[PDB]
RNA sequence: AAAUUUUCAGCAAUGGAUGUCUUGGCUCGCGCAACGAUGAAGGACGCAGCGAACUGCGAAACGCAAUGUGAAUUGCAGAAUUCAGUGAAUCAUCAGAUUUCUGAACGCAAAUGGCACCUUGGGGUAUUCUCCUUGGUACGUCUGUUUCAGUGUCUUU
RNA sequence: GGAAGGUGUCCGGUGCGCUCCUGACUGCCCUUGAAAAGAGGAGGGAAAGUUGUUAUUUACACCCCUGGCCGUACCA
RNA sequence: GUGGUAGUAGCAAAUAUUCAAAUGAGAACUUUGAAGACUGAAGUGGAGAAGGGUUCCAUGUGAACAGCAAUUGGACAUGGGUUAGCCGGUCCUAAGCGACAGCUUAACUGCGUAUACAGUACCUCGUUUCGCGAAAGGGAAUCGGGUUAAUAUUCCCGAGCCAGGACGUGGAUACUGUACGGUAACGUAAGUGAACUCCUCGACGCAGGCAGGUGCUCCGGGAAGCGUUGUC
RNA sequence: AAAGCUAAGUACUGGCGCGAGACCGAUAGCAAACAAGUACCGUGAGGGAAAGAUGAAAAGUUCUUUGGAAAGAGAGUUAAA
RNA sequence: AGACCUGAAAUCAGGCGAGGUUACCCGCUGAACUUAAGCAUAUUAUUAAGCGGAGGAGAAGAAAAUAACUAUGAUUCC
């Protein structure tokens, strides 16, 4: 939660390998950030969530 | 509403603390505890934070 | 599988590595705890977790060995590593300001000692 | 006459002179910017009027975190880098 | 004579007295001297494989290192290796580390993760640009240092 | 069919009407009806520029890059 | 802790419900249809603030709670949900309020506008002290359609605008010194302007009628579908 | 006199760590034997409870039967429900 | 031009102060209920509350002292 929209853009593409094309961001009431992360036309995203394992 | 984070989070935690006590811990050797003691209905009874 | 002395053999670079390598398994395990697994899988994320601290505890062990190697016997040591004790036991004077006397008083000291005397029966 | 003088002003009042302070409760007076029990003040707020008071706020009621650790410490004489041996 | 009301006993109900317990209180005595700008007490928010609280702890988060003891922990799960061992434990001990945001609380603030500047190291037409990143910048006061101001008292180039 | 494909979406009035807005007027006061950030104009003429890698144009036209932090459910 | 009072007082404002089928152990009370009513746009409607804090949404249910009931629920349990350069806060100052210099008091407090606060090196200027104080005052810029069980000027599709900083190609203007035109009011694709100074906007009362405009309401023709039809 | 230092014996409802008792025995003893300065009330200063005991061992009543279910009835565990 | 004197500046170099605890301890400040069978001086009391400061103890301390004796001999406590 104390992070910025910024890094989270960096941080994706140091983990994934993927690039960014917009970052949204919300505090759930918990306490946690939630980022949805639109990525570039370029890549495409259930490509990169069965290299994770989010399916 | 127009809350600060601050707020929120007072708000978040008091979320977190109104829920049933696991089951598992009753069974659990020399405990006398039943029913949580704490919990708060939002109409009832009121926090201020 | 992790112990703590077998990392003080390995040097300044591999122990970031290995750093590294276990914040990878501690990521994929956090993954599957969200997806889908077992209670066989989810007990492996207490090990792991125990053993990134015990790599961050020798690689600032091995950070405050050098520093303290380099500053022995030297004044203006760094604020880093001073001797914490308590506040009123860091102020006070030495041993020896406290217990020395002026040259008056050392001559009276000096000049009558303490004598072993006793009474006879 | 129904801005009242029980339940017609109770209807009234949605207001809040008081909000967490920081240090203290919900004793900080937001206009006055003070508190009830904690009190900008660099000393803290304590009478012997009330010594139940002082009871709920004392050293101890809290963690402890550097205070805990204490007795075990000047028991030892404050010994200071070094280890325990191995035999 | 039923029924009802009242009384006495038996059984059942309701209720928690009496009795017996007691890791708690209370009182007396005897020792010891150890909080804090090297950030205290107190506060806030987090952390467990499956926890709300209470205890514990601080992104190293019911803990890590070291030492001792030497085989558990336990509600369930799992781990079984950890089993003539460089080692089990919600164990003891504790001399080494971590120690978020705060608070005397210290860049200005404050129902605001608000608003600045300097600084380290790196990232993207630029010395002035934006970005991530490291650490700073409150007040009083002592000794020393450097740079000054005063037709203060003096010589004088 | 068991979601695929079509046409049409046109042309005029009316008002002390109701609503909010603008505009210029008229009156009222022993009542004359906030400030600052910020944006721009003018007076001034400091600077630069010698027929070409110059120099003024960064809102002349087009083109290019970046936009952090917190609130955001629901009742009222 | 427990009686008598006592299965008593009582559950009677806000016009009102009824019939069928489905669900279920169980229906005067849940849902769906059909009828019949009420609210009657200074609404019991659609949106915000204060205050509340997950009540929102879905699926499930043994109690208790919802002064009858309950298959229902703001109850209970397990999950899910709040996406912004342009909507606000943020920035400015108002009434006022904290601190600087000092001044009081044993301090606690109380007062607080007093002060030495651009062209490595060389000059020449220099009167205001820092901050807080408006989610209705001031203020850079956004609109259409679609979308989810629950979010939208925030997601998506499309069309734009603003603040800061800028490469490039192609045009203007000047090169003894910053464009021209019109009598003028002023004008056009552009059309340098430091220090210092003055000015404008920001920037402002109430009542009255009058004129014009947005939206609403209204009348008529055309094209679609719909309703009524023993009678017109 | 108008300047100055100085241990001991002495004090000690706090902190830290021990040892006792012709004391109290859950309406007592601290407000608190338990998740007690907790739940909860108050805008706030403040106010402030109730709540200990199955059994040696959970062996905490599977199984048949009625019921929508909760429960009942058989049977069963235990020295005893 | 150079000796001083006085006063500033600095995120200069290295240090020290602040706040917390209440049983005992040091200093200020300072009531009334109450008693007097009324009440005002007196009493409660040089106490409670308030504002400062400490330590393992604190304060006190080696006579500008008692005495008037055949004289004593810091301070504290019993």
Redesign the pocket.
């Known amino acids: 939660?104390?992070?910025?929209?910024?890094?989270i853009?960096?941080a994706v593409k140091e983990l994934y390998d993927v690039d960014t094309?917009?970052?949204?961001?919300?505090?759930?009431?918990?306490?946690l950030?939630?980022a949805?992360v639109?990525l570039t036309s370029d890549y495409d995203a259930l490509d990169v969530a069965n290299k994770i394992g989010i399916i | 509403?127009?809350?600060?984070?601050?707020?929120?989070?007072?708000?978040?935690?008091?979320?977190?603390?109104?829920?049933?006590?696991?089951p598992?811990?009753r069974?659990?050797?020399?405990?006398?505890?039943?029913?949580?003691?704490?919990?708060?209905?939002?109409?009832?009874?009121?926090?201020?934070? | 599988?992790i112990?703590?002395?077998?990392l003080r053999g390995k040097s300044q670079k591999e122990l970031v590595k290995q750093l590294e390598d276990l914040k990878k398994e501690l990521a994929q395990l956090r993954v599957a705890?969200v997806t889908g697994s077992?209670?066989?899988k989810?007990?492996?994320?207490?090990?792991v977790?125990?053993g990134?601290?015990?790599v961050?505890?020798?690689?600032?062990?091995k950070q405050?060995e050098e520093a303290?190697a380099a500053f022995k016997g030297k004044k203006?040591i760094p604020?880093?590593?001073?001797?914490?004790?308590?506040?009123?036991?860091?102020?006070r004077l030495t041993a020896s300001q406290t217990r020395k006397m002026t040259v008056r008083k050392m001559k009276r000291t000096q000049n009558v000692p303490k004598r072993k005397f006793a009474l006879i029966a | 006459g129904k801005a009242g003088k029980g339940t017609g002003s109770f209807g009234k009042?949605?207001?809040?002179?008081?909000?967490?302070?920081?240090?203290?409760?919900?004793?900080?007076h937001?206009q006055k910017?003070t508190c009830?029990?904690c009190?900008?003040?660099?000393?803290?707020?304590?009478?012997?009027?009330?010594?139940?008071?002082?009871?709920?706020?004392?050293?101890?009621?809290?963690?402890?975190?550097?205070?805990?650790?204490?007795?075990?410490?000047?028991?030892?004489?404050?010994?200071?880098?070094?280890?325990?041996?191995?035999?």
């Open positions: 939660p104390r992070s910025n929209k910024r890094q853009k960096q094309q917009r970052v949204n961001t919300l505090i759930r009431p918990d306490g950030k939630k949805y639109r | 509403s127009i809350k600060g984070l601050s707020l929120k989070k007072h708000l978040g935690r008091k979320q977190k603390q109104n829920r049933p006590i696991p598992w811990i069974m659990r050797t020399g405990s006398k505890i039943r029913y949580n003691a704490k919990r708060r209905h939002w109409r009832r009874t009121k926090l201020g934070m | 599988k112990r703590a002395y077998e705890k077992a209670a066989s989810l007990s492996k994320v207490t090990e977790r125990k990134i601290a015990r961050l505890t020798v690689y600032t062990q405050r303290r203006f604020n880093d590593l001073r001797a914490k004790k308590t506040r009123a036991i860091r102020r | 009042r949605h207001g809040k002179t008081h909000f967490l302070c920081i240090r203290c409760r919900r004793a900080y937001t910017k009830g029990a009190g900008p003040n660099a000393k803290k707020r304590t009478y012997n009027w009330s010594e139940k008071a002082k009871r709920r706020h004392t050293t101890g009621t809290g963690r402890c975190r550097h205070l805990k650790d204490m007795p075990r410490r000047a028991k030892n004489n404050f010994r200071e880098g070094t280890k325990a041996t191995p035999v």
